[PDB]
Amino acid sequence: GSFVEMVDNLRGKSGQGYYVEMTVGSPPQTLNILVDTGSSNFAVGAAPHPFLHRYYQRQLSSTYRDLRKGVYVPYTQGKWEGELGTDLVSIPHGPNVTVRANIAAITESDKFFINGSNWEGILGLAYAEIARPDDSLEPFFDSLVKQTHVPNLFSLQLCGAGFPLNQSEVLASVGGSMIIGGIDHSLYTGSLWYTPIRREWYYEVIIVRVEINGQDLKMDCKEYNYDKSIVDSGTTNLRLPKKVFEAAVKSIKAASSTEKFPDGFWLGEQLVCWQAGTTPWNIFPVISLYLMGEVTNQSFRITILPQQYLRPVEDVATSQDDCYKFAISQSSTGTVMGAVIMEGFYVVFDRARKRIGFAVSACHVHDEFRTAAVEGPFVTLDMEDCGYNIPQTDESRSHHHH
Ligand SMILES: CN1C(=O)[C@]2(CC(C)(C)Oc3ccc(-c4cccc(C#N)c4)cc32)N=C1N
Numbered sequence: 001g002s003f004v005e006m007v008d009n010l011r012g013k014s015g016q017g018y019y020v021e022m023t024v025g026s027p028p029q030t031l032n033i034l035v036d037t038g039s040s041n042f043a044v045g046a047a048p049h050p051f052l053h054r055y056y057q058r059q060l061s062s063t064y065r066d067l068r069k070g071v072y073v074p075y076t077q078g079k080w081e082g083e084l085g086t087d088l089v090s091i092p093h094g095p096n097v098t099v100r101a102n103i104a105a106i107t108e109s110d111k112f113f114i115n116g117s118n119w120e121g122i123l124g125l126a127y128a129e130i131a132r133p134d135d136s137l138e139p140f141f142d143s144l145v146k147q148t149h150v151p152n153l154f155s156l157q158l159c160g161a162g163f164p165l166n167q168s169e170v171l172a173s174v175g176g177s178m179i180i181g182g183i184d185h186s187l188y189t190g191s192l193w194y195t196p197i198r199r200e201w202y203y204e205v206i207i208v209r210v211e212i213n214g215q216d217l218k219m220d221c222k223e224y225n226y227d228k229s230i231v232d233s234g235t236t237n238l239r240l241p242k243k244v245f246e247a248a249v250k251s252i253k254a255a256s257s258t259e260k261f262p263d264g265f266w267l268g269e270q271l272v273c274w275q276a277g278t279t280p281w282n283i284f285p286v287i288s289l290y291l292m293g294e295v296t297n298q299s300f301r302i303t304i305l306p307q308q309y310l311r312p313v314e315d316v317a318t319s320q321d322d323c324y325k326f327a328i329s330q331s332s333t334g335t336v337m338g339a340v341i342m343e344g345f346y347v348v349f350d351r352a353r354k355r356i357g358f359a360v361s362a363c364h365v366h367d368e369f370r371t372a373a374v375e376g377p378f379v380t381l382d383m384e385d386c387g388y389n390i391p392q393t394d395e396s397r398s399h400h401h402h
């Protein structure tokens with residue numbers, strides 16, 4: 001249970017995702033690649049772009065093969081598109097292996113790359129079902145497992161930033177670990193609790209109960225998972241379905257009511273500040289998500305602090321103060337357990353056993369009074385079904401699955 005070579009192999013800027021160094025081609029071309037458990041394509045910049053210092057140069061790789069097939073991926077924000085191919089891929093601070101993987105060479109994009117994020121591509125770690133153009137394009141991790149003896153599991157320790165902050169002109173640097181093929185016991189303390197992967201597409205899970213400062217939201221538990229709940233390293237925020245979001249904000253507002261913040265703050269569109277080191281953490285409540293256990297009628301809770309859901313942003317004009325962004329936001333596409341959740345925990349994506357593990361992270365930000373927690377079991381006599389069944393479209397139904 002020791003993977004020293006892979007510890008601290010993640011970097012990034014606060015709110016701009018976590019990336020790992022990868023190489024593509026022969027000889028190896030190094031790129032920084034966003035670690036994304038919310039998608040399933042390995043897609044890299046492969047042409048000049050204003051926000052790229054470098055890109056994958058297929059012509060420089062003796063081992064590159066063109067698959068003679070394009071790929072077009074639109075999404076809420078924008079789109080990326082390009083050409084499918086294969087090449088040799090490695091993770092220098094990962095397992096000592098080289099695999100031939102599918103690579104989408106991004107030739108055109110809109111609102112995909114971010115000025116200053118320092119990443120040039122994305123590593124989709126989710127399952128084939130949500131790969132583009134379709135589920136026949138083998139995702140990277142599937143290729144890695146099939147071609148090597150690497151166990152079918154990876155784990156993520158995402159470590160958040162906190163004041164004092166080093167720089168005023170740039171966003172705070174973040175670090176973390178992606179342990180490929182194993183669990184590193186130095187990265188967590190206490191018990192490691194597992195929730196089932198409901199279905200292998202996204203890393204979909206089931207939330208059975210939500211509490212804000214020990215107070216049950218008392219909603220039909222299907223609301224918590226409408227229309228899905230997923231664990232997504234490629235989302236910064238904790239994102240909650242509309243109804244759940246409104247209930248949560250109401251509760252957090254009430255607990256923090258000694259402070260009257262502008263509406264902009266609760267919408268995540270405006271910072272709030274206190275004098276250096278005087279942030280009244282104790283007025284903000286803890287948030288507990290109870291996740292379905294491996295055992296029928298059991299659940300466990302993961303509990304996060306305001307240190308997780310209030311993101312530090314050092315203002316150039318207000319460098320004397322500690323300023324924060326509210327990082328819980330509304331969703332119309334289900335619960336997203338993003339960096340806000342993951343930064344409290346060491347998270348084990350146990351694909352082999354169709355389960356996700358949570359333990360208290362050795363690097364989570366806390367204070368002397370409260371800690372992020374993973375606690376269980378909680379037993380519920382005749383526990384309800386909290387899963388939502390997404391209405392089946394004719395187009396989806398018409399697909400064959402040979
Ligand atoms: C929600 N989500 C996405 O929209 C997506 C979809 C896709 C097509 C792979 O493209 C991107 C590109 C950048 C980011 C991005 C940009 C800035 C910060 C962070 C983070 N954390 C992530 C996220 C994504 N992947 C996920 N999981």
Ligand code: NI
Pocket residue numbers: 400401402
């Ligand atoms: Ni058929």
